[PDB]
């Protein structure tokens, strides 16, 4: 097959800045390049044909260029709107291969999350589980490090995170992590901690509970 | 142009599924219809190929055997099947249109893609749990409360706060398969001066179970 490689599997850029990305064949593809965008809702529609082309209906700030086995898609003046995934895909020979996409997010300034840390409701107490959640909110870059501790011992087994999508507004993200223990394992230890590691600080961001701090 | 998808999507390991795409706003057998598989894991794959007009069809060679590409003229509609169905095919699947540019092709219109999900769960409504803040004073001048939605399949379910008169400071997680169910979470964080003194529910719509669950946050 035709193995199609995109430089930059991930890319941080401001609005406004000149974003430009580039796929590579695996031997000459005679310009028989098309370029694909995938919105973060999972959408798809052509941007860009044999090579440099560009399609009905799309914004006149997508070009592209390329020959031999090197091409690349640019967008002269980056929109919010355009934050996706882009994908070539070579038309050159069977089977169609395509590249494995680059995503775009728009950088800005580092912020800290904004942890908090709840525990299990007596709700779910009651059905014999304990989940104990902690939201880690509103922080930039997405890069984030949470550890679970208990009496000082680390997580690992229970846990479950979850990230959101780049917030459209104020381009930061946010996640969830929750530890999941059966009431008996839980009522047998006092505090629960979640520790969150990030660029914003040197020292990690610890929010705990005890149990038995029935306030 | 438009291309319509739709075909079985929750399947159990071993069956078969016969996705459709029906297409509209062109001649029909004038252009050829290509299928695409994407697997969470980012990345797209090309399986084969199927032009109405002279029946010619060709696959790619990983999924020629478990596939069968098939048109309905008269309908104006594609099908391809998969069959002997496992874990690993659960992907959204599309089907695009090929048009002739001088010299190749350009997948120039795209289906809006099926969502395949090879799983054992049968349809279980959420279990929501109210999440108050802990211990000791949780926050200063805002404060966040959650909402733990916990086993359900399928998706989605929708979450809302005060029927959705709160928007603002809400976060929704995406759901996550645990064991064959999914698990989400929301939070929202309102001033001190709203809660508890002011009443914040969590309203949370399961539409495959016909379920609606209304989780008040109350103090602990």
């Known amino acids: 097959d035709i193995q199609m490689t995109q430089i930059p599997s991930s890319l941080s850029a401001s609005l406004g800045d000149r974003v430009s990305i580039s796929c590579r064949a695996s031997?000459?593809?005679?310009?028989?390049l098309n370029w694909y965008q995938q919105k973060p809702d999972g959408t798809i529609k052509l941007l860009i044909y044999?090579?440099?082309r560009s399609q009905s209906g799309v914004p006149s700030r997508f070009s592209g260029s390329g020959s031999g086995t090197d091409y690349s898609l640019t967008i002269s003046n980056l929109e919010q709107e355009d934050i996706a995934t882009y994908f070539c895909?070579?038309?050159?020979?069977?089977?169609?291969?395509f590249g494995g996409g680059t995503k775009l997010e728009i950088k800005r300034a580092d912020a800290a999350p904004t942890v908090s840390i709840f525990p299990p409701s007596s709700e779910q107490l009651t059905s014999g589980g304990a989940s104990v959640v902690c939201f880690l909110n509103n922080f930039y870059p997405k890069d984030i490090n949470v550890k679970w501790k208990i009496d000082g011992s680390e997580r690992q087994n229970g846990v479950l995170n979850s990230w959101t999508d780049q917030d459209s507004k104020d381009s930061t993200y946010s996640m969830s992590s929750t530890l999941t223990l059966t009431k008996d394992e839980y009522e047998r230890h006092n505090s629960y901690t979640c520790e969150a590691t990030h660029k914003t600080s040197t020292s990690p961001i610890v929010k705990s509970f005890n149990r038995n701090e029935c306030a | 142009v438009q291309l319509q998808q739709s075909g079985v999507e929750l399947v159990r390991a071993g069956s078969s599924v016969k996705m459709s795409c029906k297409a509209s706003?062109?001649?029909?057998?004038?252009?050829?219809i290509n299928w695409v598989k994407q697997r969470p894991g980012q990345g797209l794959e090309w399986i084969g190929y199927?032009?109405?007009?002279?029946?010619?069809?060709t696959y790619n060679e990983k999924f020629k055997g478990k596939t069968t590409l098939t048109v309905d003229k008269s309908s104006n509609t594609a099908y391809m099947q998969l069959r002997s169905l496992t874990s690993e095919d659960s992907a959204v699947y599309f089907c695009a249109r090929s048009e002739y540019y001088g010299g190749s092709y350009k997948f120039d219109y795209w289906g809006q893609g099926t969502t395949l999900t090879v799983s054992s769960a049968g349809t279980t409504p959420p279990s929501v749990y109210p999440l108050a803040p802990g211990s000791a004073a949780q926050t200063n001048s805002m404060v966040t409360l959650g909402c733990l939605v916990k086993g359900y399949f399928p998706e989605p379910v929708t979450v809302t706060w005060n029927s959705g008169s709160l928007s603002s400071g809400v976060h929704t997680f995406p759901a996550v398969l645990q064991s064959d169910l999914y698990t989400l979470s929301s939070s929202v964080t309102v001033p001190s001066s709203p809660r508890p003194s002011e009443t914040v529910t969590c309203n949370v719509a399961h539409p495959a179970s016909s379920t609606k669950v209304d989780k008040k946050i109350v103090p602990r």
């Open positions: 706003g062109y001649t029909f057998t004038s252009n050829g």
């Open positions: 031997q000459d593809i005679n310009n028989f």
């Open positions: 895909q070579q038309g050159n020979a069977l089977p169609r291969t």
């Open positions: 044999f090579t440099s």
């Open positions: 199927n032009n109405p007009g002279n029946g010619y069809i």
